[PDB]
Design a binder for these strands. Sequence first.
DNA 1: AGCAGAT
DNA 2: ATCTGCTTTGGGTGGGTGGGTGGGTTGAGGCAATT
Lengths: 612, 43, 165
Amino acid sequence: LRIIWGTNVSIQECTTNFRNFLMSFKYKFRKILDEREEFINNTTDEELYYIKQLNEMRELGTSNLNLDARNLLAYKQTEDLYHQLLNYPQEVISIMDQTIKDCMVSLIVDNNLDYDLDEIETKFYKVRPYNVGSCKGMRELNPNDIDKLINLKGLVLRSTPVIPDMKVAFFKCNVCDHTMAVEIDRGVIQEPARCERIDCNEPNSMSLIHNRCSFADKQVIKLQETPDFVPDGQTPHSISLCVYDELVDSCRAGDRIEVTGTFRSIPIRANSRQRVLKSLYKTYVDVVHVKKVITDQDLAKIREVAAREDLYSLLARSIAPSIYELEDVKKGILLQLFGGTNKTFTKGGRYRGDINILLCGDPSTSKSQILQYVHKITPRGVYTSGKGSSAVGLTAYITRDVDTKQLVLESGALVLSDGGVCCIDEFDKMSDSTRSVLHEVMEQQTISIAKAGIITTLNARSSILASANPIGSRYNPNLPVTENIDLPPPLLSRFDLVYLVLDKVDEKNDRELAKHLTNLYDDVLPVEFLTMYISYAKEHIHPIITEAAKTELVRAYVGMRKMGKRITATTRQLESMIRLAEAHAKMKLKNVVELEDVQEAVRLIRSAIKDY
Amino acid sequence: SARHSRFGGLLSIQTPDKTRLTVSGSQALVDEKIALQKLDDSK
Amino acid sequence: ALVLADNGICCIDEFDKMDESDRTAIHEVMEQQTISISKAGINTTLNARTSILAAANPLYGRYNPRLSPLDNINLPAALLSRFDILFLMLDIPSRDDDEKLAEHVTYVHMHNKQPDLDFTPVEPSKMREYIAYAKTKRPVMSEAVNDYVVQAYIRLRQDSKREMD
DNA sequence: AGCAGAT
DNA sequence: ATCTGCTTTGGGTGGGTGGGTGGGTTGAGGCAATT
Ligand SMILES: Nc1ncnc2c1ncn2[C@@H]1O[C@H](COP(=O)(O)OP(=O)(O)OP(=O)(O)O)[C@@H](O)[C@H]1O
Ligand SMILES: [Mg+2]
Ligand SMILES: [Zn+2]
């Protein structure tokens, strides 16, 4: 008879109980348990749940079964099983795993299906319980909880590289070349004193072939508690975790996760020579479950919105609803998000499809708001402020890993914005070296670093949406834009659009703005739909120019040159106009650039040249 | 064993007479022939 | 120290002297109300909805009437604008006021107690509990008050433009 | 003092 | 089964032909680059 050590509960009864639970169970039991019986339907609740879950798992070939604890309390049989799971998690999880495998094989055996049985026999099967009681606190873990299932909510802080954990040792003889694999128990190798071969019984002739053993994946994570659990505001404590097999690399640094595991404790050796152990035991958590806290229909909805006659103003309004009366700026930013076509050229250089916009004006107006909105919308991008230590940094820089004491090349904000929008909030205050790397990016669209023995180039195909403020307390219309902005002419000449949003004091304008602001205390689109639409268009559509567009572009450029001797427009404006027309075509999901696209692009560029 | 080596499942097998022996391993937790094989091999 | 002040008022003395790093930190706090750390050793982001109470001295060490306030203040104009209320306290010699201050300080030095007797100060505990009670509350505003504040805003903007002239 | 080796 | 023998913690009562990706981390002083 098999009995768990220190208890009086049979393993056979546990196995049969859980098998009965799995083969026969319905969600209606859970619904009645939670006092939600009136919500019971007639098809899903009356159909076997875990049998369906096993069938689908077999169809998909997966093995891990996510189990909810309450369902054990829902079935009369399994109350004791639930309590035992909460008190003796290891053995209970073991019997659960074997019962899962046994029922999996029994299903095929009974249903005489054509599915291969050898493949099923080869698989290790597992269960991942979760929601096993009110989550406790890292500061409330007393010794009473050692070897017991607990729930912890905390913020990931770090995760070590995968550790190879040994399962089966491999030994080879030096006089007969006979090999046999010996399992491992609690980290001790039961290495033989002589070959198992009768013919060659030579003693103490075993060697460990390290690369022929069997290993399993292990990883150590560090966890820190949530802010709301801090009683006064002191430094949050830290607990260490251990994740094995498919939970390895299941969470990235900085994530909020809820972890279910067994609170274990292990002795620590005093030194790496003897067997003496410190009286203080070190704790950790053995995790068994972790939680983190386009379709044809989507395509059809996208076509439906695209067919709308008033699409342009709709997207413009939806970009930043809370801002008031900045239609031109919103339209320009909407064009920037989509981005113009990118050209891969043979016999010629690469031509960038990005759009760079500078939002410069008085401090009163709303400019950081628009950058925050754009960051939210952008499928890829960063937020940064020049001369800001908080920001990661605009340029790739060589550093030393404090955790591992190694040199690592870390990419800056510009490189991490590849294919996206990098919003720089404070463009005015910038280091000269930062303004050099920015020039190299906006010109060559790559960052080259040749220090610390490394010579490498990093792609930085990212748009830029910066903001600027005047030197004084307000913008002086009399002086030119260059004098007020305090930026080199070489630098503010590269932006495709420059927007002068000025807070001129007008009775009507102030009245309207105050009314809007106080009221804050034409449909609009959700941010998720907007970002998905933008990503779809940016990944699939690639508009092309046509003869009519070619005529209108040439004519508009010539007209913009003839206005002036003073040079009104330069060849830069032609590239800006073509990029803006391409972006406007992208927004309509059109594969061609019509007269309307080029005409819209000129209207925005000419207006931008206008007050700027 | 599906779980790692340090999972730590302990067993108590009952002899025909009222004495309990201790075995370690999930396979033992499930099976009895494996338990007896481990008993013999651990000598 | 800023972390301890999260969701509370921060008491910063000698604000003008402060280094550019801390100035950028507070600039971030006011705009975003967030504490961000970007280091290889650790990467932890904490929200900070905390108020700032600053004390500073003019550029030359004393206020100069000839120079306007802006020039007297070393701090960026944007930082001054972001402040909800900016108080400028000056030390003007005067026979009566000087005599009153001297009598007050000197009585405090001789007797070790407050000199005033016209009114009795309220107990600190009562004031603290009332402040907490007020923090617990939540008022509301109507449309008529909205119109009144809007009118006040246009009046203030016109006056401020005229003054800025 | 615990553990690693030669008679 | 008994007798013989080396080495710690971590630290200068082992050292710099073992080094600093094996840990002992502030304080002062010189140098290039930044100003
Ligand atoms: N539609 C709007 N027009 C003008 N000002 C606005 C509008 N909406 C909000 N604001 C004001 O702008 C503030 C947000 O803008 P923000 O303070 O970032 O200004 P900025 O010009 O980007 O920079 P700075 O920080 O130097 O003032 C809001 O707090 C509100 O006071
Ligand atoms: Mg701003
Ligand atoms: Zn052999």
